[PDB]
UniProtKB/Swiss-Prot annotation:
Function (record text): Located on the platform of the 30S subunit.
Organism: Pyrococcus abyssi (strain GE5 / Orsay)
Subunit text: Part of the 30S ribosomal subunit.
GO molecular function: rRNA binding; structural constituent of ribosome
Keyword Ribosomal protein listed: yes
The protein's name: Small ribosomal subunit protein uS11
Gene that specifies this protein: rps11
Segment of the intact protein contained: 5 to 69 of 137
Amino acid sequence: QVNIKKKEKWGIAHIYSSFNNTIIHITDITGAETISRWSGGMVVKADRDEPSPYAAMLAARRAAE
RNA sequence: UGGGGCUCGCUGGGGAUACUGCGGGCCUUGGGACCGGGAGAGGCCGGGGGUACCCCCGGGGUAGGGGUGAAAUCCUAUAAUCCCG
């Protein structure tokens, strides 16, 4: 780590929004580094719940840690 | 018996001159024509920019994705989707 002056980091979060699935994907402000990728069909077992809001909160909570 | 009409498509002579024909002359209401201002996804030609989709290459990043009412065939593990260049 080369000295940080601000002591705050920023991660732009791309949100790709389908009626077949939801994808949440937060990267660094450049976009050149992928910390974490989590979708709505690892959370669940079935295709119907692949989208919805409830996958699209839980997917966006695992990343967030 | 006497009078009329008859396809009724023909002809000769005289007469009228609105209309029509023809001939001549004359005029701008129609038409055409010109000049100047003017809008438009009219046509053609040359020039040039950006969107998004796809594709290909490098990096980053893992367990999926695709698809449906459910599914399967099919995409992806020499790495897909995704994100960055």
